[PDB]
Design a protein around this ligand. Sequence first.
Ligand SMILES: Cc1ccc(C(=O)Nc2ccc3nc(CN4CCCCC4)[nH]c3c2)cc1I
Length: 138
Amino acid sequence: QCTVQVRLELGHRAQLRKKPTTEGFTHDWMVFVRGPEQCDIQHFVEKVVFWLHDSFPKPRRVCKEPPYKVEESGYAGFIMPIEVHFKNKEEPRKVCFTYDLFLNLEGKVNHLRCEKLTFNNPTTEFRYKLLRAGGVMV
Ligand SMILES: Cc1ccc(C(=O)Nc2ccc3nc(CN4CCCCC4)[nH]c3c2)cc1I
């Protein structure tokens, strides 16, 4: 009976371009998954999959190593599913967030969403990956 908590930070920045691109993109944005300061989520994260709006080319964007992010331009916000896959042999194998990639049509957005994962009775192997990433026993 051991519990290990880890923290993920999901976020995005978005800025209204001074002048739109020749292709009518009004906004640059960047979305990411990371750990807090001094933690290393690559120890227990296999890959992060960002599911972009179906209008984007290759909207299944995968990062297998850090940084777990996508940098894009576009013209609108949307709801972006983000799957974080674990280096876990048992359940849960992954967690899915629905991320609100919203834009400020009149300027800049800099948003952070903090997600605390609780793993009950991880395998010895996966427990090792969580604590090495900076996870805490509860
Ligand atoms: C409700 C909605 C929200 C966002 C988009 C959008 O911005 N789509 C989009 C579609 C294609 C794109 N292509 C780029 C520019 N490239 C993409 C490939 C890598 C280099 C940058 N940005 C793109 C943005 C479309 C809709 I309707």
